[PDB]
Amino acid sequence: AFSSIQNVLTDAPLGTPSAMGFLDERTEKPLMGPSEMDELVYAVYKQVFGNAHIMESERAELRDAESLFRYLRDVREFVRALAKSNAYTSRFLQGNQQYRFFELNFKHLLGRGPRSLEEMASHSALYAEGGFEAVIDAILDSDEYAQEFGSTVVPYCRFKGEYPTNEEFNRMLVLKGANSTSDKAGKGRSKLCYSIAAGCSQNWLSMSKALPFGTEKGTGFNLISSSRNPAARPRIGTKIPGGVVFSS
Amino acid sequence: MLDAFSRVVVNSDAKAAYVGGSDLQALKSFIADGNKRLDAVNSIVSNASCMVSDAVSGMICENPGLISPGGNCYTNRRMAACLRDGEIILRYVSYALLAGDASVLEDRCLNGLKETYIALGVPTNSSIRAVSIMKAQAVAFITNTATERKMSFAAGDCTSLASEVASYFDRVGAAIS
Amino acid sequence: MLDAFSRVVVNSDAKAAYVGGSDLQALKSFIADGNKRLDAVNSIVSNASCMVSDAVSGMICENPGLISPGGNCYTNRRMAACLRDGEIILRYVSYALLAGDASVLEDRCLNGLKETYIALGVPTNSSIRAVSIMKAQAVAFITNTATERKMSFAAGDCTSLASEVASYFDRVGAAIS
Amino acid sequence: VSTTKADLRYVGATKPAAVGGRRAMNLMKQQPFWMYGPPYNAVTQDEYEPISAAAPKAFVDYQIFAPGTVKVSPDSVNANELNPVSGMSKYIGKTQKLVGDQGISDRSDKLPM
Amino acid sequence: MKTPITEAIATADNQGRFLSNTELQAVNGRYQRATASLTAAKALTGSAQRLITGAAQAVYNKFPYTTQMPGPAYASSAIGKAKCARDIGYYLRMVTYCLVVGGTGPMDEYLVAGLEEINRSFDLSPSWYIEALQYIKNSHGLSGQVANEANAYIDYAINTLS
Amino acid sequence: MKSVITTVVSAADAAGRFPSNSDLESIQGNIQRSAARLEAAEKLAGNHEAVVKEAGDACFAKYAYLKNPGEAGENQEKINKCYRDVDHYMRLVNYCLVVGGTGPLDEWGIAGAREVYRTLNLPTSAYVASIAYTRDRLCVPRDMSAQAGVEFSAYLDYLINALS
Amino acid sequence: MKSVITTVVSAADAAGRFPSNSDLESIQGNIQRSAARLEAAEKLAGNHEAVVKEAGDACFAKYAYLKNPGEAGENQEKINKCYRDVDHYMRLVNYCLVVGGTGPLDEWGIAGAREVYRTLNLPTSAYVASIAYTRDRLCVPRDMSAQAGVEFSAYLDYLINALS
Amino acid sequence: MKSVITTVVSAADAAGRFPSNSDLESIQGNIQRSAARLEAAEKLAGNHEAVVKEAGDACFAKYAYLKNPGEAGENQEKINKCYRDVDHYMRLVNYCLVVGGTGPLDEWGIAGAREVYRTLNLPTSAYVASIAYTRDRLCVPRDMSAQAGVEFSAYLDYLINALS
Numbered sequence A: 001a002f003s004s005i006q007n008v009l010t011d012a013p014l015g016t017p018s019a020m021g022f023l024d025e026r027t028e029k030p031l032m033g034p035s036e037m038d039e040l041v042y043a044v045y046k047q048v049f050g051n052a053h054i055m056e057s058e059r060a061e062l063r064d065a066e067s068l069f070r071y072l073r074d075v076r077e078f079v080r081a082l083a084k085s086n087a088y089t090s091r092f093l094q095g096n097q098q099y100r101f102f103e104l105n106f107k108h109l110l111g112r113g114p115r116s117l118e119e120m121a122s123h124s125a126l127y128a129e130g131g132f133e134a135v136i137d138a139i140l141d142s143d144e145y146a147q148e149f150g151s152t153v154v155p156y157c158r159f160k161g162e163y164p165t166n167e168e169f170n171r172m173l174v175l176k177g178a179n180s181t182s183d184k185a186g187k188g189r190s191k192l193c194y195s196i197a198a199g200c201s202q203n204w205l206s207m208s209k210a211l212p213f214g215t216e217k218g219t220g221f222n223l224i225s226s227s228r229n230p231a232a233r234p235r236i237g238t239k240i241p242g243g244v245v246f247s248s
Numbered sequence B, C: 001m002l003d004a005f006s007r008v009v010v011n012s013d014a015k016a017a018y019v020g021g022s023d024l025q026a027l028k029s030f031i032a033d034g035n036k037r038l039d040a041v042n043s044i045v046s047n048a049s050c051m052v053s054d055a056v057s058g059m060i061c062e063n064p065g066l067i068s069p070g071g072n073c074y075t076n077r078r079m080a081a082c083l084r085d086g087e088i089i090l091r092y093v094s095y096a097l098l099a100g101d102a103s104v105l106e107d108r109c110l111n112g113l114k115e116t117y118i119a120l121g122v123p124t125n126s127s128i129r130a131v132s133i134m135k136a137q138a139v140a141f142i143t144n145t146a147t148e149r150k151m152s153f154a155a156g157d158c159t160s161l162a163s164e165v166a167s168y169f170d171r172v173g174a175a176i177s
Numbered sequence D: 001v002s003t004t005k006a007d008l009r010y011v012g013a014t015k016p017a018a019v020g021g022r023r024a025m026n027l028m029k030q031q032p033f034w035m036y037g038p039p040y041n042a043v044t045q046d047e048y049e050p051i052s053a054a055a056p057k058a059f060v061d062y063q064i065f066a067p068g069t070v071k072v073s074p075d076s077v078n079a080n081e082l083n084p085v086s087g088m089s090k091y092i093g094k095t096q097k098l099v100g101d102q103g104i105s106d107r108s109d110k111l112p113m
Numbered sequence E: 001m002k003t004p005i006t007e008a009i010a011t012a013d014n015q016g017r018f019l020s021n022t023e024l025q026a027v028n029g030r031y032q033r034a035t036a037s038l039t040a041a042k043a044l045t046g047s048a049q050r051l052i053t054g055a056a057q058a059v060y061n062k063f064p065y066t067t068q069m070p071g072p073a074y075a076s077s078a079i080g081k082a083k084c085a086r087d088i089g090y091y092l093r094m095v096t097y098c099l100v101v102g103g104t105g106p107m108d109e110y111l112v113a114g115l116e117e118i119n120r121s122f123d124l125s126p127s128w129y130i131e132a133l134q135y136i137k138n139s140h141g142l143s144g145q146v147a148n149e150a151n152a153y154i155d156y157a158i159n160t161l162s
Numbered sequence F, G, H: 001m002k003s004v005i006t007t008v009v010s011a012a013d014a015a016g017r018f019p020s021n022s023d024l025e026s027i028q029g030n031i032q033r034s035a036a037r038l039e040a041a042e043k044l045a046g047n048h049e050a051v052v053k054e055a056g057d058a059c060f061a062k063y064a065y066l067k068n069p070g071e072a073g074e075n076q077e078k079i080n081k082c083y084r085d086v087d088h089y090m091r092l093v094n095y096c097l098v099v100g101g102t103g104p105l106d107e108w109g110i111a112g113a114r115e116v117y118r119t120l121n122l123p124t125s126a127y128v129a130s131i132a133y134t135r136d137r138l139c140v141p142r143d144m145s146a147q148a149g150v151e152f153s154a155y156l157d158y159l160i161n162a163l164s
């Protein structure tokens, strides 16, 4: 856990000042004033919707979720109100494949990528047993959500440095594109559909496209192909005074 | 994930075969050296920090271009991350040595690592060198062959465990190649 | 991202060279016209809405097929969506003009835009026309050459800044091509 | 057209090693600086002498001394002289071996013993 | 190359005859002797760098003048110690080759053919290598016919050095 | 890159608005003070082999034990490495004096310095001793004008604080 | 053009003899493999601007040094001609998928290319890296059929081995 | 070897005739220009490791992307062989300064170099940039004499025009 590129090649995360005012004897939090709250909501819209170019006819329906937010500063309940709206479902549930919706939730509300097939299976079982709202409630009330973002910050794609598995890093970069990249390029057809169920990894170029500035992205590519061969059994020796031993 | 006992179980499940007495020499012998494996794993994890700091310094020793401006290991940030990468590899090979199976390495480590390094521009050859330095001093510690760092053990041969951990480091080396 | 001062710093870091007095004519001259650049940026952002509303209408003027059913700009949704884009590109070129560097243009707006438009079926030629109309009226406002919209300035030449902003619009035009 | 220096040095390599001692390696010559690198790995003459194997247990405290006696100097104060953009450095690493001179030594003047 | 296979072929070819039952029995002896020799080869492979370092240390402890006397033939400097460890590794590699092959075929081809020429010109005493081989025989940690088969190729090298 | 411009345009980006005059006012603040803050640019640039000269030896004098066996300065080219490693910090304070903010320093020398200085066992007290040496080795009338000395010291004690 | 028909009529013309059974037997295999290579060529024809855009940025992602001044990718005129040359190579690969042989490649893109790329300072490794990126982003079920992918990657490897 | 003597005896041998006055007249100019080219070659011989070191870092300063993984300058074995090949080219230039013609260049460094550098993925522009840097750091009275510098830069331009 060092984040060699979290807070130096990337800006700091955005959100509420601090959670101590939540203890609330005379107020719930220092009135951030209306001009440092409209940028907070602008930031949330850019995250939970992920640059969906929402018109104001479609922002005339999120008035009620917003109006409670500036009154009672929990961010997590704001996104819980947003992800259950028709604005969220009509964009991400309506035209899409299933694991596409599931994987987009990891990008939007958790800021990381699905680490395995079993996580996707657990989400699938949890959806089948009565609704999609259960999926969002499991994610939002999760432990992982508490020990990553909490009730203060916008959920952002954090470079952890100390990932539980490496494919989690790859699949974080593939869902997160560049700026001016949205989530209706493919008509469904999730990007990690094949790679999750198979276990292989993703394209090197599309991961490198999403890296921040000044990170020597893309280089170091040998001109022969990139995916390794599981079936390879190479011999590599060590060096001994008498000879070379293939300690394999 | 799997271990040595869960290896044979899934192998026999592919045949729908019970685990009979013929297949239990491998496991009962696995239990014979059980104290040997425990005597080896704390010897390795007991020197964990020194092994990594020696490994990256050895990497740098014969590749001074990594320090140079534009080097992948140029600034303190990148040394810090590269320092982090050594512990992640060493911890996972220790897990695999403890479980007696590398079913935890390439699903929760190598699986999707080569592409991560390719996207980040991490040089493969120098990382392979770092892994091999770590490999050689892994065997040095298992066999009590380190120049200093005299550890008290029980007399016998741990050579098979040495070859096991060498094979585990091998697949880390070949996974990112 | 980078600016004019952070340009030369990273250029000299590739040489491990100090930023000496020889390299500071470029920056000290950059500071000489500092008031000129500020006098230019508010002139541009002061007409931001009119420039976009003129640009998309000019787009439509010689391509009436965009209004037609099946046109990419057919319904009010798509005008609204397209309307955003004229202002959004304008904001990023204004940022780049202010910073004196297009490092916040081809890394925050133009990265992956061609593929996004290809997937969405956005016509490239008409968008390039919209960008060029915006370009021409950017220079018109910087040089105080607009037919109406008399703005008070200080006397001198802003032609270099005009060339700069034209070069910035150029790379937007070439990024989606 | 030989010289006195060359002949004096070469004559020490004509005695049997049990007699000549260190001088038995006196027939080797300086080589181009890149011949000492990874692929070729030419050996220098300082690697055949007991001076390259000295690793004693005892050490000097470097604290017992009153302040103002210990001296330190670098080889230079410059980033891209101690290590160029490439890995070819004379001061850091294992590339300080890749130097044109330093391939032989004049330490065979001491004695034959 | 002296194997039990090739000597049986050489005895059949000398008469110019087909392979009789004599040759087939000589090959069958190799086959039900090989199971312990392949274990000996695995075990000597596994313990290799430990045994080489221990053998070099045992030679330095028995003959301390080799680390002190100046000259190219001695391990007083670093390259001398590197070449000494290289020679001990050469001996261990030939022993393992003779184990897996099944006779003194490799080391007759690679080690003892013209060996004393080198020790006479390079002035390296054979008693050093005898002392290293005695350590390797005492410290390989084998049991039964595995030990009987590894030791039997060790003292062949010892007998040729003496 | 933490600069005066990068703060305001990033803020405008987050708010999704055009640059207002409150934003332009900060760049005006740059317009005044670059002249004072770039006057030290030559002073560090042309005089730098001498300041590392006096700084590294002061570091090694204040902690003489560090050359003992088993410490960081046990051979020669490690001492040369030390002198290089302070040269880097001088190169970064020059960069920061040029950009106007602490951009270059906190992402090229400060970010992640922690682990590196602990796992390689390098005492940070030695770094801060050498830096504090140059902080007061400076003279206001002789070295610079009055205001370059303020801002050079303000950048130096920035890293003298982070390292602490 | 190097193809199936032209090789056997050129061989029969060099021998001065009528088309025998082996010549017609060679055309039956053209009839067989045209079912795969034509629907490879059609799928390449219908989606070529996506592939030329996708493989063009892999060249500058692998070699970011081309955009520096003094290099061959400085301004937009060089990058536009880079995309144009990559589109030319993809069009020749589409042509070889149609004709059945490497004729249109060998005569319109390969012969003489080395003198041009050496003379005009064009690095061949980056003209190769786009073709190498195009090969690895192919899934037979997802992008084409199974034999169509083999037919496509064979011509890609032919172009790569010709320029390398 | 392409030189002054060999051209005229090869021409007289092709014609099958004795050496005439024009052949000897061609050797008088060799006698004239040997006073400049030999003391160019001697000054190159006495100080070659400084020039090979000086021109080697210009290659990686201009092209810093070679030290990335996947490239041709990853580890120290590649950089050492880079310096070795630059030293080879400088030795061949010293040889051509002695023989009087471009013989040792044309046969030991130039002929066949294009197939090797294309096959082994060696970019020729960086094998050129070191020779280009060596030419520009040649002042007229300091490094050698006036005609020696002309004689040196002519062979440098010959090597540059051959590899480009």
Ligand SMILES: *C(=C)C1=C(C)[C@@H](Cc2[nH]c(/C=C3N=C(/C=C4\NC(=O)[C@H](C)[C@H]4CC)C(C)=C\3CCC(=O)O)c(CCC(=O)O)c2C)NC1=O
Pocket: B047, B049, B050, B051, B054, B055, B057, B058, B059, B060, B061, B062, B132, B133, B136, B137, B138, B140, B141, B145, B146, B147, B148, B149, D093, D094
């Ligand atoms: C650069 C030229 C260079 C280095 C930097 C340095 C790094 C290095 N060290 C070894 C060998 C060993 N490392 C060991 C580790 C430790 N010793 C200890 O006492 C503690 C517990 C621990 C960390 C300090 C040991 C014991 C050795 C001896 C060999 C062995 O494995 O036991 C190497 C060689 C790598 C190898 O092949 O083992 C390197 C690169 N040495 C340098 O040359």
Ligand SMILES: *C(=C)C1=C(C)[C@@H](Cc2[nH]c(/C=C3N=C(/C=C4\NC(=O)[C@H](C)[C@H]4CC)C(C)=C\3CCC(=O)O)c(CCC(=O)O)c2C)NC1=O
Pocket: C047, C049, C050, C051, C054, C055, C057, C058, C059, C060, C061, C062, C132, C133, C136, C137, C138, C140, C141, C145, C146, C147, C148, C149
């Ligand atoms: C369709 C046939 C068609 C149009 C619709 C209309 C759009 C258009 N306008 C111009 C030229 C200008 N636009 C200007 C913008 C403004 N004028 C103002 O006073 C306010 C501040 C602002 C928005 C209302 C100006 C000043 C001009 C004159 C030229 C200039 O740049 O100053 C064009 C031409 C585009 C160009 O090349 O500049 C178009 C298409 N005109 C139509 O023909």
Ligand SMILES: *[C@@H](C)[C@H]1/C(=C/C2=NC(=C\c3[nH]c(C[C@H]4NC(=O)C(C=C)=C4C)c(C)c3CCC(=O)O)/C(CCC(=O)O)=C2C)NC(=O)[C@@H]1C
Pocket: F043, F044, F047, F050, F051, F054, F134, F137, F138, F139, F140, F143
């Ligand atoms: C005055 C308030 C001080 C003082 C100053 C002196 N410094 C002297 C020499 C010297 N000073 C520095 C550091 C300084 N010079 C720089 O160029 C920069 C940054 C650009 C700084 C901080 C150096 C490196 C040197 C050595 C080279 C030189 O002589 O300039 C000096 C001359 C005698 C001496 O060595 O001290 C003076 C008087 N000295 C004081 O006593 C007070 C505290």
Ligand SMILES: *[C@H](C)[C@H]1/C(=C/C2=NC(=C\c3[nH]c(C[C@H]4NC(=O)C(C=C)=C4C)c(C)c3CCC(=O)O)/C(CCC(=O)O)=C2C)NC(=O)[C@@H]1C
Pocket: A186, A190, A191, A192, A193, A194, A195, A203, A206, G043, G044, G047, G050, G051, G054, G134, G137, G138, G139, G142, G143, G144
């Ligand atoms: C392949 C091993 C993976 C997989 C990869 C994905 N490809 C994606 C998009 C994509 N890929 C190509 C190249 C390929 N498709 C073609 O049609 C042709 C030529 C005719 C080629 C060479 C293109 C052109 C595209 C964009 C159009 C499209 O959507 O297919 C993709 C989507 C994300 C992305 O942009 O990379 C993925 C995930 N998909 C799989 O299912 C297997 C496992």
Ligand SMILES: *[C@H](C)[C@H]1/C(=C/C2=NC(=C\c3[nH]c(C[C@H]4NC(=O)C(C=C)=C4C)c(C)c3CCC(=O)O)/C(CCC(=O)O)=C2C)NC(=O)[C@@H]1C
Pocket: A003, A004, A005, A006, A158, A159, A160, A161, A162, A163, A164, A165, A166, A169, A215, B056, B072, B073, B077, B078, B079, B081, B082, B083, B085, B086, B088, B089, B108, B109, B113, B116, B120, B122, B123, B126, B127, B130
């Ligand atoms: C050091 C010996 C290496 C080296 C390492 C660097 N890695 C950098 C970033 C990075 N590394 C990994 C792999 C690591 N993370 C994991 O979770 C696991 C296994 C579970 C491993 C092995 C990841 C995923 C990342 C990116 C994570 C993130 O920061 O978001 C890095 C940063 C460079 C920079 O961008 O400034 C370095 C230097 N680099 C080397 O050259 C040697 C070979």
Ligand SMILES: C=CC1=C(C)[C@@H](Cc2[nH]c(/C=C3N=C(/C=C4\NC(=O)[C@H](C)[C@H]4CC)C(C)=C\3CCC(=O)O)c(CCC(=O)O)c2C)NC1=O
Pocket: A064, A066, A067, A068, A069, A070, A071, A072
């Ligand atoms: C589901 C049911 C439902 C509601 C009824 C409203 C109730 C309501 N009104 C306001 C918030 C407000 N409500 C009013 C309304 C009025 N002030 C007056 O003097 C008039 C009597 C009345 C208009 C007729 C005003 C003026 C504010 C904001 C005042 C301010 O703080 O500037 C807020 C705070 C929300 C926020 O901004 O964070 C809420 C919850 N919202 C709901 O979700």
Ligand SMILES: C=CC1=C(C)[C@@H](Cc2[nH]c(/C=C3N=C(/C=C4\NC(=O)[C@H](C)[C@H]4CC)C(C)=C\3CCC(=O)O)c(CCC(=O)O)c2C)NC1=O
Pocket: A098, A099, A117, A118, A119, A120, A121, A122, A124
């Ligand atoms: C909205 C539409 C929709 C679907 C159609 C299914 C499709 C589907 N099936 C499975 C997952 C599966 N699907 C099957 C089904 C079958 N295997 C067979 O051999 C038979 C042909 C078939 C039953 C008739 C099996 C057996 C598994 C799990 C196998 C395993 O991994 O153990 C998964 C993986 C989900 C997960 O577990 O993470 C998905 C997405 N899901 C959906 O959301």
Ligand SMILES: C=CC1=C(C)[C@@H](Cc2[nH]c(/C=C3N=C(/C=C4\NC(=O)[C@H](C)[C@H]4CC)C(C)=C\3CCC(=O)O)c(CCC(=O)O)c2C)NC1=O
Pocket: B032, B033, B034, B035, B036, B038, B039, B040, B042, B142, B143, B144, B153, B154, B155, B156, B157, B158
């Ligand atoms: C909970 C933590 C935990 C441990 C650390 C181990 C500790 C441990 N090791 C061994 C026991 C042993 N350990 C070794 C190992 C060695 N002997 C050598 O001389 C070699 C250098 C080294 C090889 C690695 C051997 C050879 C034995 C005896 C054989 C055996 O017990 O299987 C034993 C049984 C006998 C004894 O007490 O010594 C125990 C309890 N067991 C545990 O439960």
Ligand SMILES: C=CC1=C(C)[C@@H](Cc2[nH]c(/C=C3N=C(/C=C4\NC(=O)[C@H](C)[C@H]4CC)C(C)=C\3CCC(=O)O)c(CCC(=O)O)c2C)NC1=O
Pocket: A051, A052, A053, A054, A179, A180, A181, A182, A184, C056, C059, C072, C073, C078, C079, C081, C082, C083, C085, C086, C088, C089, C108, C109, C113, C116, C120, C122, C123, C126, C127, C130
């Ligand atoms: C920060 C950078 C940034 C941008 C530059 C834009 C880029 C952009 N534009 C659109 C979306 C769009 N862009 C346009 C605009 C146009 N198409 C035309 O035919 C005209 C040439 C042009 C008007 C001038 C249209 C019409 C759509 C919507 C198309 C659709 O209905 O799918 C979308 C996705 C649509 C959505 O999510 O609703 C995006 C990401 N947005 C960003 O985030």
Ligand SMILES: C=CC1=C(C)[C@@H](Cc2[nH]c(/C=C3N=C(/C=C4\NC(=O)[C@H](C)[C@H]4CC)C(C)=C\3CCC(=O)O)c(CCC(=O)O)c2C)NC1=O
Pocket: C032, C033, C034, C035, C036, C038, C039, C040, C042, C142, C143, C144, C153, C154, C155, C156, C157, C158, F021, F024, F025, F028
């Ligand atoms: C915070 C917001 C902020 C600004 C808007 C600018 C405002 C501004 N502009 C200029 C100053 C100027 N502005 C211009 C520009 C022009 N003159 C012309 O006739 C051309 C039409 C036009 C070209 C674009 C010129 C030529 C000067 C004088 C030269 C200079 O000051 O560099 C000056 C210095 C002199 C003056 O007061 O006029 C100032 C404060 N500065 C700021 O700090």
Ligand SMILES: C=CC1=C(C)[C@@H](Cc2[nH]c(/C=C3N=C(/C=C4\NC(=O)[C@H](C)[C@H]4CC)C(C)=C\3CCC(=O)O)c(CCC(=O)O)c2C)NC1=O
Pocket: G059, G066, G071, G072, G073, G077, G078, G079, G081, G082, G083, G085, G086, G088, G089, G108, G109, G116, G120, G122, G123, G126, G127
């Ligand atoms: C019918 C077959 C056919 C082809 C295969 C191409 C082959 C080709 N490509 C280029 C030409 C080129 N190719 C590139 C490409 C690159 N240089 C770089 O900096 C990067 C390495 C890479 C980007 C991908 C560039 C920049 C030029 C123009 C060279 C120049 O004009 O300087 C030229 C020179 C003429 C020109 O295009 O202006 C030719 C003949 N043209 C054809 O007619």
Ligand SMILES: C=CC1=C(C)[C@@H](Cc2[nH]c(/C=C3N=C(/C=C4\NC(=O)[C@H](C)[C@H]4CC)C(C)=C\3CCC(=O)O)c(CCC(=O)O)c2C)NC1=O
Pocket: H059, H066, H071, H072, H073, H077, H078, H079, H081, H082, H083, H085, H086, H088, H089, H108, H109, H116, H120, H122, H123, H126, H127
């Ligand atoms: C007598 C005449 C004569 C020559 C002129 C050279 C020519 C030459 N150079 C190289 C070989 C080389 N030349 C380079 C140099 C570079 N590659 C880079 O990354 C940079 C672009 C540049 C550094 C300056 C490298 C790295 C190799 C080794 C290629 C490899 O082994 O992969 C080889 C391949 C064999 C080898 O050296 O291992 C040959 C024949 N050799 C000769 O015998």
Ligand SMILES: C=CC1=C(C)[C@@H](Cc2[nH]c(/C=C3N=C(/C=C4\NC(=O)[C@H](C)[C@H]4CC)C(C)=C\3CCC(=O)O)c(CCC(=O)O)c2C)NC1=O
Pocket: H043, H044, H047, H050, H051, H054, H134, H137, H138, H139, H140, H142, H143, H144
């Ligand atoms: C035999 C081959 C050979 C060369 C290719 C050149 C190249 C060369 N230049 C310098 C070294 C130098 N070269 C110069 C350059 C110049 N100095 C002047 O008086 C001129 C005005 C200007 C040349 C146009 C300077 C100022 C130095 C010293 C600083 C430096 O290292 O560059 C050195 C280091 C040795 C030295 O101090 O000279 C070398 C090898 N000199 C050679 O001997």
Ligand SMILES: CCC1=C(C)/C(=C/C2=NC(=C\c3[nH]c(/C=C4\NC(=O)[C@H](C)[C@H]4CC)c(C)c3CCC(=O)O)/C(CCC(=O)O)=C2C)NC1=O
Pocket: E056, E059, E066, E072, E073, E074, E075, E076, E079, E080, E081, E083, E084, E085, E087, E088, E090, E110, E111, E118, E122, E124, E128
């Ligand atoms: C095929 C198998 C094989 C064997 C057996 C072999 C032996 C061998 N050992 C040699 C040298 C050497 N051997 C030693 C080894 C030692 N000297 C000591 O003092 C130590 C006690 C002892 C180490 C245990 C040393 C120091 C040299 C260098 C002697 C010299 O160069 O003069 C040389 C001279 C060539 C050279 O310099 O490498 C040969 C041929 N070479 C082989 O290829």
